[PDB]
Structures are given as C-alpha cells and as structure tokens.
Symmetry: C6
Subunit: 182 residues, 6 copies
C-alpha cells in the first residue's frame, strides 16, 4: 500500500551511471549533463527513494539507495568545487582510494542481495567490479583499465534500468511481464 520507491532510485542510479560511463568509455567528456544528472537524479531522486524505503521495511533499500545518492552528490561536488575555487582538483590516487571504499561497501551489500531477484544480484556484482577497476585505473593511472571499467559501467546502468522497469511493469500488470529472477 506504500508505493515501491525502488524503481525511482534504480532509474536515478542507472541512467546516471550510463552517462558517466559514456564518458569513461571515451565517447564524451565529463559534461554538465553528467553533473546535473548526478545532482538531481542519481543523487537527490535516489536519496528520496532510500528515505522512502524506511516506512517500508527495507533496511537494505534505506542503506543502499540513500548511500548511492550521497555518492553521486559527493562526486558532483568533487568535480565542481574546483570550478568554484574552494578545493583544488583531486588526486587520482586519492580519487582511486575513494572509489575503492565505495567498492567494498557494494561488495558487502552484494551478499545482501542473494535472496532477492537475480537481476538485483547482477547490478551489485557488476557495480563492485566497476568500482574495483576504477580504483585500479586511478591509483596506477591506466587509461585502458578505466575504458574497460566504462563498458562494465554501461552494463550496470542498463541492468538497473531494466530491473526498475521490471518492478514497475510487473506490479502494473499483476504478472511478471519482464523476467527478473525472483
């Protein structure tokens, strides 16, 4: 009877992850498109979804969605505080360690997805791999590893968008029109 906020948070997260990984692949630069999306949709909208998981019983969704929206808000801030002259750019090795800490949080949360749907297990698996590769590629500096991570990132966003659209549509019809792997 309380709506499911998981699709909103999953859409917010997934769509924004794709755009950032279109840059990481190399097709585009880290644009105001990625930044605006990280502010309002991958951040704010996902924080909303996470807070709405509270009156549902969902500690995982509360812990997950809220944490990743906060991640997108930190990321946009790291990129935009220099353009405001408050902080200097980041150190990519420090940027690498930052992305690594978010990686282990996802690693633990993966074990939390094991009784849930199978698409959900995949988005947490792929997201751990994405963060891992970016942690390596930024600490050592390999542009190649970051290009490979980018392709893993595009898949991650597509999975999360599908899972969200899976949830919303199965609820809408009453039967599982899009397979998820419950």
């Amino acid at each position: 009877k309380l709506a499911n906020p998981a699709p909103l948070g999953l859409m917010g997260f997934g769509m924004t992850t794709i755009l950032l990984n279109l840059h990481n692949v190399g097709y585009f630069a880290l644009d105001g498109i990625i930044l605006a999306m990280g502010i309002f949709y991958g951040g704010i909208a996902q924080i909303f979804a996470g807070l709405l998981e509270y009156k549902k019983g969902n500690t995982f969704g509360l812990t997950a969605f809220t944490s990743y929206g906060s991640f997108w808000l930190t990321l946009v801030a790291i990129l935009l505080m220099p353009k405001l002259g408050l902080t200097d750019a980041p150190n990519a090795q420090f940027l690498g360690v930052y992305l690594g800490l978010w990686g282990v949080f996802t690693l633990f949360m993966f074990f939390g997805t094991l009784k849930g749907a199978r698409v959900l297990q995949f988005v947490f698996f792929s997201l751990t791999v994405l963060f891992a590769l970016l942690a390596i590629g930024n600490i050592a500096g390999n542009a190649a590893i970051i290009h490979f991570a980018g392709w893993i990132g595009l898949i991650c966003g597509a999975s999360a968008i599908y899972l969200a659209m899976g949830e919303v549509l199965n609820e809408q019809f009453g039967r599982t029109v899009l397979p998820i792997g419950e």
Copy 2:
C-alpha cells in the same frame, strides 16, 4: 481521503513542456521563462506530485512524476551551469544520448499505462515520440527533425493539461464531465 496529486504533476509537466517546445518549433528562444517554469512547476511541483503518490499506492505515479520533475531540474541545470562558469556548454550528441535515455524510460513506462485511461496512454506515447525525435535531431543535427518534435511536444503538453483538468473536474462534479477515455 488523500487528495489526487496527478493534476498538479500533470499541470506542472504539461505547461512547462508547451513552453519549451514553443522554442523547439522556433517561435521563441530558450528563455528564462522555460527555465523558471522548468525549475518551479515542471520540476519542483511535479516532484511534489511524485512524492505525494507514495501514500497513495501509486508506484507508477511515484516513479513517473518524481523522475520528470528531476529531468526538468537537470535540463535547467545543464543550460544554466554554463552561465555560471561551472561547466562548458554541452555536446549535442551527448545531449541527444541523454534525451534518448529518457525516451527509453518513457517507452517502458508507456507499457505500464495500458490499463489506465486513454489520454494518459497518449501523453506517454507522444512523450516517447518527443524524446526520440529530439535525440535523433540532436545526434545528427537536423533542425528540421527538431522543428517537427516541437509540434509533437505542443500536443503532448496539451494532452497532459487536458488530462489534469479532466481528473480535477470529473472529481468535482461527481460524474465524468470531461472525457478522458477511461
């Protein structure tokens, strides 16, 4: 007992979409009017609508209304972050890829409207079409395709404003005074 937030969310979205596409048709430039409406009515007020669907059972309206207010916030942000020297203008091919992803989101969400009224299915069809044409016209650079999508947006906004005003007025009289193609 809980009010219907859909007319407000539809009004905010619908009115702001008309204004933006009066520019896409070519009659006007991308003004602060579109930006102001995109901030407060197509964005915030629709975000209110999406959040107010939560205590209703409406996962769809929560997912829908909340995401499009966020989109309008991202759009104004992409256009105004350059004026602030935070970001450089954006790649239109990236803008096209951004607008296309929102089209894929609406496309799935249209399939969710299949048991709902007819106008709602129409707004989601034209809105799927709107995002598609603009994404095409922006990746390739066809001013003609963009002038055509502008006309599709004008009808689309008219549909949502009509749907919103239907719902509010059908509720008020107790009989369905405005046809919504239930």
Copy 3:
C-alpha cells in the same frame, strides 16, 4: 480536526496580487515589495497551503494553491534571473503566452468551483479575466489593457482576502458572520 489551510493560501495569493496590481494599475513600479511578497507569501506560503490540502481530501485546493504559489515563484524568477546575469530579460510576447497558459488553467479550475461558495467562483472568474487581459495586453502591447487588468487584479486580490477572512471568521464564531454564499 486538521486546520483549514485555505485562508493562509488565499491571504498569500490575495495580498501579493493586490500589490502587483498596484503596479499594473500604475501607482508604483514593480518593487521589491511585490518581489518579496511574491517570494514568501504568494509563493512559498501558498505552496504550503496547497500541500496542507493533501491530507485533507482536497484535490482542488492541492492543485490550485500549489500551482499559484509556483507561478509566483516562476514570475519572481523571471524578474530576478536577469539581475543575476542568468537569463536575458524576457520577451513580452512569451510572457503573454506564459500568462495565457496560466489563464487556461484558471478557466478550467473555474468550472471546478461551481459547487463551492459564491465568492470562490468570483475570485476564479476575475483571475481568469486578469490572466486573459494580461496575455492580450502583452502579446499586443496595449498599455491600456494592462491598466484595466490591474484594476481587475486589485478586485481579485481583495476578493481572495475577503473569502479567506470569511472562512476563518465564520469558523471561529459558529455562524456566518461574514456572508460568503
């Protein structure tokens, strides 16, 4: 048991509308008085009223009060985003089309007041005339149309204040001390 938010929203709307039409009539310039009131009283305070109508059963008041406060916020944003170098001043024609869109919303919402009190039907009719005249007076450029609309706006705002004070004053006494019909 839940308080009535309509007087707050009507007060915010009405008072803000009077002051803005004191400029549209011509007695004063488009001041920070109008701009402040448009930010906090006709905009924010009315958005509260609209949002407080939600746990009540009131879809009309939710959609109406919330949309008009948002209008006042967009209006102030259109008038103040230039002073900040974010947006060029706006073409009046659009303003007319923008005020015209807000007019059509008000027209439909007028048909929605047909089972409510009488003063409420009047504020929504006169506001429909107000939005309509301004849309015309701005697309065409008639200063005269805008001077007349201002007087329609002063009457509209005074009506919303009167209705608001009716509801609050009728509720307090137990009889309809102010006739609202």
Copy 4:
C-alpha cells in the same frame, strides 16, 4: 497530546517586534540584529509554529503564525535585496500600502480572537494600531507618528511575549500562575 506551538510563534513575533520598534521609537538604527531576528525567530521559527497549528485543530493559529512569519521574511527581503543589487530601494508610499495590507489582515484576525483569551485580543489590537500608524506615517511621512507607532509596537511585542510565557507556564503548573483571559 501534541505540544502547543503558540508560545514559540508568540515568542518569535514578540521578541522581533520589540527590537524593530526600539529602532522605530528611535533608540537605534535598523541593525543587522533586527534582520537576523527577522530571518530566524520572527520569520522561520514562527512559520514552524504556524505549520504546527495544522495537526492541532487551530486554523486561526495556522493562518496567523504562518502569515506573520512570511511577513517578517518579506520585510527582510525588501530591506536586503537592495544591498544585493536585486531590488532597488522600496517606495515608502508603497511600503505604507504594504504595511496597510498587512494591517487589514490583522484587523479581521482581531475579530477572530473574540471568544479566546484576553491578552491574545490585545496583541492583535496593538498590532492593528501598529500597522495602521506605520502605514499612515509612511504614506504621509510623519516621523512623529512612526515614533509614536514604535512605542505601540514595544507594548505589542512585550504583550505577545507575556502571553507566550503565560501559555507555557500555566500548562507547566496546571493552574494559572500568570494571569491571562
């Protein structure tokens, strides 16, 4: 069972008015002290109080506390948008009309207090007189009326504080330790 939000809103308004009229009486200039208080205590904190009247049954308190908190926000915005290069200075005739609009709102809300406590009736009386004289003194320009209006405001503000500490202290003791109506 829900806490009483009137003492907070009364405190926010009352304390802020006292400070502002120490300027209107003439003791001080219109300081940033008044502006800070107008932002956070007579403004935001009272808006909280107004909104907290909603789940209580109190439409009068909702409408009043919420409207005056917004009023204090509009005034600070009117005084500070010039220092920000947004709004030029305000027109004193218009400010008088603006304070006049806020004056009529208080006048009606005064008639709503007729079955309520006695001190509450006084604060709305003095606020009505306060707004009236300031509108008079501002459209007309008598510094003396405004110096006189200020002295009315110090009494108005001191009374609202007195009512607030009454409400809180009478509830706390269970008997009326501080006399109110």
Copy 5:
C-alpha cells in the same frame, strides 16, 4: 516509544556555549569554530530537537530548544552578515538589549523548570545570569563583566552536557548512573 530528543538539543546548546565562552573569558578569538558550531549544532541540531518535542507532549522543550537554536542562528547571522556586506556590524548596546531580551525569555522559562530535574533548573538559572551579565557588560562596556559572564557561561554549557549525558545514560542502563535530581 519516541526517542528523547532533549539530549541532542542539550548537547548542541551546551557544547556551543562552552566554545563561545572560551572566547568571552579571553582564551581565544571569536573563531569560525564557534560560528560553525553555532550554525549546525547549537542552531540546526537544536532546532531539530525542538521540533521533535512536538509529537512528544513537550511544549516546554518545543518552545525552548527551537528558540535557542534560532538564537544561535541569529547570533551567527549578526556576526557573518557584515563579512557579506549586508549589514554593518552591530552596535553593542543593541546587542546588549538583544541578549537582554533572550535573558528575559530565559527568566520566565526558568520558572517552567520547577517540576523538572534539578540540573535542568540550574542550566536555566545560569543561562539567565549569562544573558544578564552579557547584556550589562555590552551596554556598559565592561570587558570585566564580559569576562565574568564567560566563566558563568562555561558552567552553563557544562551543565547541559552533563544533563544530556545523564538522560541518555540513565535511559540506557535502567537506573540513575548519573545523578540529575528528578
């Protein structure tokens, strides 16, 4: 069943009062440390505590915590609006009259603590003396009274911290580990 928000408001108030009075005593200048605390802990967090007293039955705490969180916000604003060129520094005597009004508010609220705990009566007594002395020392120009007010303020802050930790620790253990004076 609702948490007790009083310890949060008492912590914010008390810790911020100590810091400010390390300056009033003379050890330090009115540093940004005092101002940061005044914004977020003595101001914002205490306003949270105050709003949380509403669903409890607690009008005193609602009226108290919410007003003093606002005081700390007005205090920061008085000190930071000149650095923004919005206001010219305050006059003192007006500052003294301002702190004098907060003293009269605190005085009445002291009579309200007479059925509450004994330490609670003390924080309101010493705060009344704190505001009184600072009002005098600022109207009269005595650096000496303002140094004396500083030491009373250090005690006032320490009481609130002890009281807060009594409340939290007594609830946690089930017996009164720290004496308060119920």
Copy 6:
C-alpha cells in the same frame, strides 16, 4: 517494521572518517574528497540516520548519529568559511579544545554502549581515543601524535563500516553471517 537506519549512519560516519585520517596519516592532503564526503555522507546522510532513530525508540542512536552528522558539517564549515573570506583559519589550540569537547561527548556515549554489541563498544572506544589524541596533538603541536591518532582513526572508520555491514547482512540472512558480538 521501520528500517534500521544505523547501517546508513555507520557507513556515513566510518567511510568519511577513513578518508580524513588518510590525510592525518600523511598520505594525502585535506582534499575536496574529504570535504565532499563530510558534507553529504558523514554529515547529511548521518543526520538522516539519526533523525530516523526517532520513530524507532532509539534516543542513543538519535543523539549519536545526529550529533556526528552535525560534527562533520561544522568541520567542513571550519575548513571552508576561510576559503570564502567569512572567517579566518582556525587556531589549532581552539580546534584542539573543540575536538576535545567532541571527545568528552564520545566518552560518555561510550558508557552508553555497554549492553550493546561489542563492535559498537569498540567504535566508541577508538573514537574517544581518536578525539583525545587529536585534541592533544593540536593543543600541544605534536605532528607525531596526529600521525598516530590518524592510525587509530583508520581502525575506527573500519569498525563502523564492518558494524554497518554486519547489521545489514545479519538482518538480511536471518542468522549472524558476520559476527558483531551481541
């Protein structure tokens, strides 16, 4: 039935603490990464966690998460109000007293964890040592103590993440997959 907000608050606190102490250890400078995390994850997200403890019965979690979330926001404000020309950098002895005040708050709240999980007791033990050492290293000026406290801080940050992921994963599986010493 209300989600457990402790993992969110614990994640926010811990992850951000690790990074700030990667600076205290000496590997990195006080980056925009540390500032971004302090704003959104160690600050906002933890205030969220703390406020959600209210409808649960948890006065301790309310007092703790909200106060620390406020701490990161004051610390970010201390580091950023100078970059804006609002305040002058802090005096390190005054910072030391400020961090010491947060230390006594943590010391008392430690006594509040004695019936809780052992890891919970550990995060409060190491956090008390962390504040005490940093308060000492800044009052006296020992860079060495601050290099050592940084190591104690890293351990502390690790615990809070471990406890957070313990809580989430134990609820999710139904058995204690990760030991927390209940």
